[PDB]
Amino acid sequence: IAKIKKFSKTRSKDIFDQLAKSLAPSIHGHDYVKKAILCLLLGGVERDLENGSHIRGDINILLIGDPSVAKSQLLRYVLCTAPRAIPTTGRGSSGVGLTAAVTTDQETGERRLEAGAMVLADRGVVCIDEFDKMSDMDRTAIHEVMEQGRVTIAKAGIHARLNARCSVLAAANPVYGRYDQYKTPMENIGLQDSLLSRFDLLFIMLDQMDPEQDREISDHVLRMHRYRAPGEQDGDAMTQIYEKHDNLLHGTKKKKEKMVSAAFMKKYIHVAKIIKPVLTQESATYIAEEYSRLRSQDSMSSDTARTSPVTARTLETLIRLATAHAKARMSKTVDLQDAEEAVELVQYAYFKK
Amino acid sequence: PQEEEEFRRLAALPNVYEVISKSIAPSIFGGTDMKKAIACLLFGGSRKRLPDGLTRRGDINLLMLGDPGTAKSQLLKFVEKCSPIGVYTSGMVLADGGVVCIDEFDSRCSVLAAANSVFGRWDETKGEDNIDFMPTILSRFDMIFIVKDEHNEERDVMLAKHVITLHVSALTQTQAVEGEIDLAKLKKFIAYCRVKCGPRLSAEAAEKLKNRYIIMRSGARQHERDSDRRSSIPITVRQLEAIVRIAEALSKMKLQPFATEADVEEALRLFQVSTLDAA
Numbered sequence: 001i002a003k004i005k006k007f008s009k010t011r012s013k014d015i016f017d018q019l020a021k022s023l024a025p026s027i028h029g030h031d032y033v034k035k036a037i038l039c040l041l042l043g044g045v046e047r048d049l050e051n052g053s054h055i056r057g058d059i060n061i062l063l064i065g066d067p068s069v070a071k072s073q074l075l076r077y078v079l080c081t082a083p084r085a086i087p088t089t090g091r092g093s094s095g096v097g098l099t100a101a102v103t104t105d106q107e108t109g110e111r112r113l114e115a116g117a118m119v120l121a122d123r124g125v126v127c128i129d130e131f132d133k134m135s136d137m138d139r140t141a142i143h144e145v146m147e148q149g150r151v152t153i154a155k156a157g158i159h160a161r162l163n164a165r166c167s168v169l170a171a172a173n174p175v176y177g178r179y180d181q182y183k184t185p186m187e188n189i190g191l192q193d194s195l196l197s198r199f200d201l202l203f204i205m206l207d208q209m210d211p212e213q214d215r216e217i218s219d220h221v222l223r224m225h226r227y228r229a230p231g232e233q234d235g236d237a238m239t240q241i242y243e244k245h246d247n248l249l250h251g252t253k254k255k256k257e258k259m260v261s262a263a264f265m266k267k268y269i270h271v272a273k274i275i276k277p278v279l280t281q282e283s284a285t286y287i288a289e290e291y292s293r294l295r296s297q298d299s300m301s302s303d304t305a306r307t308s309p310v311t312a313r314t315l316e317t318l319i320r321l322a323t324a325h326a327k328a329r330m331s332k333t334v335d336l337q338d339a340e341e342a343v344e345l346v347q348y349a350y351f352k353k
Numbered sequence: 354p355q356e357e358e359e360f361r362r363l364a365a366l367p368n369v370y371e372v373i374s375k376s377i378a379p380s381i382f383g384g385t386d387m388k389k390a391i392a393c394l395l396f397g398g399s400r401k402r403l404p405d406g407l408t409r410r411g412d413i414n415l416l417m418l419g420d421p422g423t424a425k426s427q428l429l430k431f432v433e434k435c436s437p438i439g440v441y442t443s444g445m446v447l448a449d450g451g452v453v454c455i456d457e458f459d460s461r462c463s464v465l466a467a468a469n470s471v472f473g474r475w476d477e478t479k480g481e482d483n484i485d486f487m488p489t490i491l492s493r494f495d496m497i498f499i500v501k502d503e504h505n506e507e508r509d510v511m512l513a514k515h516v517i518t519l520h521v522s523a524l525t526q527t528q529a530v531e532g533e534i535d536l537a538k539l540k541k542f543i544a545y546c547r548v549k550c551g552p553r554l555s556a557e558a559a560e561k562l563k564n565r566y567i568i569m570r571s572g573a574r575q576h577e578r579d580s581d582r583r584s585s586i587p588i589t590v591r592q593l594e595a596i597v598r599i600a601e602a603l604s605k606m607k608l609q610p611f612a613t614e615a616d617v618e619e620a621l622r623l624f625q626v627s628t629l630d631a632a
Contacts, residue, residue: 067489068589076407177487178583209574215567221590222563229404235553238402 004268007241008330016328016341019268022259024077025249027070028220032348035341036061036201037078039324040125040167041269045276058167059320060146060198062131064189065205066178071171075127078169081266084124088117090133095141100162102155111158118145118164131172132190139195142168146198170199179206185307185352196308200317201349204307223248239263277326279319283334287322290343291315294350304351318342360545363534364608373606376534378431381424382515387498390415390623391432395452395543396606397463398598399551413598414464414493418484418631419500420474425467429454432465435536437544450547459485466494475501484585491586495595496627552604554597558617562600565621566593573632586632596620 011018020034039059046057063071079085088098100116118126128134144151149165174180175190185204189196196202227248228234242258250259294310321342326334363369370389377388377395393413400411417425433439438451445453448462458468471485484491491497529535534542554562573588599620604612 067492068591173489177489209570211571214570218563218567218590226559238404 003241003264004271007268012329013337015330016325018260019265019328021257022243022265024074025259026224027073027077028217030070030074030205032345033063033074033203033205035345036203037074038328039321040078040169041082042272042324042327043167044320044323046165054148054150055316056147056149056165057320057323058149058165059200059317059324060168060170061201061203062170062172062196062199063203063205064172064174064179065203066207067173069205069207071205072129075129075169075171078125079127081262082125084121085127086117086121086124087127087129090128090130093117094135095138098138099141099151100153102153102158111155113153113158113160113162115162116151118142118166119151119162121166122163123165125167125169127169127171129171131170132175136192139192143194143198179204181206184305186305189307193309197311197313199308200313200320201345202307203349204352223251272327272330275327275330277323277331278333279322280334283322283336283339286336287315287318287339287343290339291318294346301351304353306350307352308350310350314346318346321345356541356545360542361608363542364546364606369606370603372532372534373539375531376539377435378428379530379533380519381427381431382512384424384428386623386626387428390496390498390627391428391465393599393602393606393623394463394465395432395436396546396602398601399553399605400461409594411598412461412463413495413595413602415466416458416491416494416497417465417467417500418470418475418497420502421469422502423500425500426456429456429465429467435540435543437540464494475499477501481582481585486585488583488585488587492589492591495592495598496624497586497631498627499631546605546608550605550608550610552601552609552612554600554604554612554617555614558600558612558614561614562593562596562617562621566596569629576632584632586628588628588632592624592628596624599623 008015016035016038020031020038023034023038036059040061044057044059047055049055063074065071075087079087096116098117100119101114102111103114104111145164145166146168149163151162151164153160153162174188176183176188179188189202227246239261241260241264243261245255245258291314294314318339322334322339325338325341366372370392373392374385374389377392378384381388394415397413398411401409403409419425429441432452433441433454436452438448440448440451440453442453442455444455444457445460445462448460450461452463452465455464455466458466459471468486471483475483569592570588573584577584596617600612600616603616603619
């Protein structure tokens with residue numbers, strides 16, 4: 001408790017930068033993806049009104065890119081770190097697996113409800129690899145969960161409603177196998193407008209073979225490969241806030257900075273998720289003006305194209321990302337930079353040249 | 354127990370590689386590089402686990418492209434016969450650590466695939482667009498070989514003479530040409546080598562392969578940029594892993610605990626001759 005408070009007070013604005021930086025040392029680059037994963041771990045705020053209407057507080061992110069850009073590694077890492085993480089591949093689980101079903105018990109003759117994949121994963125993370133291979137029917141089934149976080153089931157003799165408030169990670173490959181630079185993102189993604197709109201963030205990853213980028217990636221992979229766990233004999237077959245520095249894991253250049261330990265990061269994430277932020281009036285007008293600029297950017301798009309349509313859900317996405325960023329640092333109110341970070345994320349994700 | 358001494362004596366020779374290569378389909382004329390690749394595929398690499406729980410493939414996958422009549426099905430049948438575990442398909446669970454041969458390409462299993470040209474016969478002038486498989490599925494294969502009907506009058510005469518000699522002397526005698534190993538003995542030797550031990554690379558060989566991989570990636574970049582066209586056979590870290598596996602298999606063939614630079618050089622030469630010529 002004391003260590004968490006000391007780290008929060010000393011590192012005031014550096015919490016969100018450091019947690020994203022120290023999210024996955026084994027994976028190089030993709031700072032925006034790490035920030036989005038951190039926002040998912042922090043989560044939004046679920047609001048219930050007097051009339052009983054429910055507003056979703058979860059975020060949906062879809063990752064599309066070329067093969068071998070360390071996407072499955074991120075999914076596996078999130079599965080390991082998340083408390084309630086369930087992996088469901090594209091064709092591994094159908095609508096029956098994802099959505100709870102009704103089975104008639106022969107012993108008593110009554111009908112009982114058996115929970116589906118999403119029903120069990122309440123307030124958790126669901127990772128879906130090869131989402132492009134998934135059929136449209138499963139997408140429509142997942143649409144209800146992504147919209148209202150609930151599943152309605154009605155079979156003669158019984159009817160009930162189950163909660164499905166969950167966040168989803170999806171990784172998919174382009175229709176052509178490799179992302180086409182010349183062709184528009186709409187053709188490469190090959191998904192319906194409703195599915196993209198229900199998704200909150202879209203990330204496109206490119207395997208740019210720059211000499212420096214290739215050299216850095218190769219050096220990082222080679223350093224990780226040559227690393228061996230201490231205390232183990234060579235050739236044998238088989239909590240501090242800052243992690244102990246290693247000559248191979250970190251490097252001589254990275255001696256100036258240290259990475260956060262996994263256990264302390266998990267405890268801080270849990271404490272932050274407990275925290276309930278409150279939106280301020282100053283940020284509301286700024287967010288509204290930026291949303292109006294985003295909607296009016298159609299005449300200012302220049303030669304850049306849009307990956308996803310901008311709808312009313314984007315404003316809710318902006319508010320939810322601001323709430324997650326406010327959860328990143330222990331506070332009570334929403335500041336200007338809190339919304340600016342979300343706006344920068346939206347600018348990076350939505351527009352591509 | 355005596356077969357242990359026999360295998361140790363056989364593997365201690367300086368010419369085990371050549372004997373094994375000659376033992377792979379002595380009936381088929383030519384294809385020495387293909388026979389060596391088939392042999393090292395049969396020996397295979399070694400799988401390694403990690404503390405994080407991730408696993409890396411210890412099996413090699415190969416792809417063959419060529420005109421009909423290049424004796425591909427015969428090679429697949431010979432591989433299926435020689436391997437301790439072998440499955441032959443026309444295009445996985447029952448095979449564990451064995452070799453699966455797939456014809457008409459258009460779970461710890463090694464994959465050996467054969468396929469035909471898109472137009473039926475290879476077109477040299479057109480270059481690319483002769484392969485229908487997407488780059489994503491092509492990247493899984495460690496090496497890709499291209500065979501063309503090299504029409505030489507003297508080569509046709511030699512091929513006919515070899516076929517007729519096999520036909521005539523086949524019923525008369527069934528003996529090894531020059532120290533060829535019997536099928537059962539080779540099978541048992543391969544099984545013993547796979548069961549006994551698996552080698553690992555060294556630091557100097559690692560650095561050499563690192564430099565060669567960087568140079569090859571830069572050259573592939575330059576070729577793609579100059580050609581102004583996307584190559585159907587990209588080069589990634591999986592190619593480096595495949596070369597590492599081939600070098601380990603070459604070291605495994607000699608039962609040495611540590612791989613040498615010669616194995617890495619031979620693996621690099623084979624990878625060049627296959628992929629770079631294919632690409």
